[PDB]
Amino acid sequence: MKLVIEGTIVLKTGMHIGGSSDFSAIGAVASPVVRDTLTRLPLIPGSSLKGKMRYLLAKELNNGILLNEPNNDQDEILRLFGSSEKDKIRRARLKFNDIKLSNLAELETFNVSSTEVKFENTINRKTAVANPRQIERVIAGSKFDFEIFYNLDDIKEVEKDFENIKQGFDLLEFDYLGGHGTRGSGRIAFENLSVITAVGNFEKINTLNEILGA
């Protein structure tokens, strides 16, 4: 049985994830955000969401500090986000996906593009001169409908797994998702979370649905 964790990521601030570090232009936006190049719609990679969730969730478990290699931190983290140790390997139950922006229609009704340019600088404090900085940022209020496939390997662990998943989702609400987060960007807020089956039907889907949808 395989479950699908359906929801929406809502941007509270910028969320500057991703980009080619090549030259863009001379006086134009530098380090653009990652996009789905067929549409060139702004994108959340599943790698970013998975890595940030794994970091925060493995910091809350192993209570306090996380000073270790990611291939061996905590057994719940290992069974949730995969493993690659030599004599001890188990699969990830979660399959993250590349998230695309979904509310471009609502952003077109406001006569705004899906992305903006934030202007920054710094002040070299010995000479007190400025050094400007343009970064592309997705606008706030941008919605990102995501699907994560959950591989239900064992019935005895699924409630602890979604307790940990709701724990990681609560941890991401008080942290940033990508990019210059300590400078007022990247703040997200998960909403409309639910779990539905892929094929067939799961019997105790309700305890999962409202330990996660609460």
Partner 1 sequence: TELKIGNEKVNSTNFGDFAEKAIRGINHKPFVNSKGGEQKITTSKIRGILELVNKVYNRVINTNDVELSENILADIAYIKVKIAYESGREPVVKDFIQRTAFTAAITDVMNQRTRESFLLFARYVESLIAYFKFYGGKD
Partner RNA sequence: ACGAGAACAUACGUUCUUUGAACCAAGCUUCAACUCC
Partner RNA sequence: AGGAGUUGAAGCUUGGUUCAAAGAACGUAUCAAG
Least distance (Å) from partner 1 to the CB of residue 182? 21
Binding mask 36-65 for RNA (x = CB under 7 A): ---------x-xx-xxx-xx----------
**Could you say whether residue 120 binds its own copies (CB under 8 A)?**
yes
Of 33-62, binders to partner 1 (CB under 8 A) are: 35, 39-41
**Could you say whether residue 19 binds its own copies (CB under 8 A)?**
yes
- As a whole number of angstroms, the distance between CA 137 and CA 185 comes to 9
Burial code of 169-201, b = ≥16 C-beta within 10 A, e = fewer? bebbeeebbbbbbeeebbbbebeebebeeeeee
Place of tokens 């359906």: 6
Select from 21-29, 108-116, 151-159, 191-199 the region that touches RNA (CB under 7 A). Answer: 21-29
Instruction: Name the token pair of 202.
Output: 């799961």
Handedness of CA 33, 35, 41, 46 (dihedral sign): negative
Handedness of CA 42, 46, 52, 53 (dihedral sign): positive
Q: What SS3 state is found at 72?
A: coil
Q: Binds 114, which of RNA, partner 1, its own copies, none (CB < 5 to 8 A, cut-off by type)?
A: partner 1
Q: Binds 30, which of its own copies, RNA, partner 1, none (CB < 5 to 8 A, cut-off by type)?
A: RNA
Interacting residue ranges for partner 1, rule: CB under 8 A: 21-23, 25-29, 32, 35, 39-41, 110-111, 113-115, 117, 136
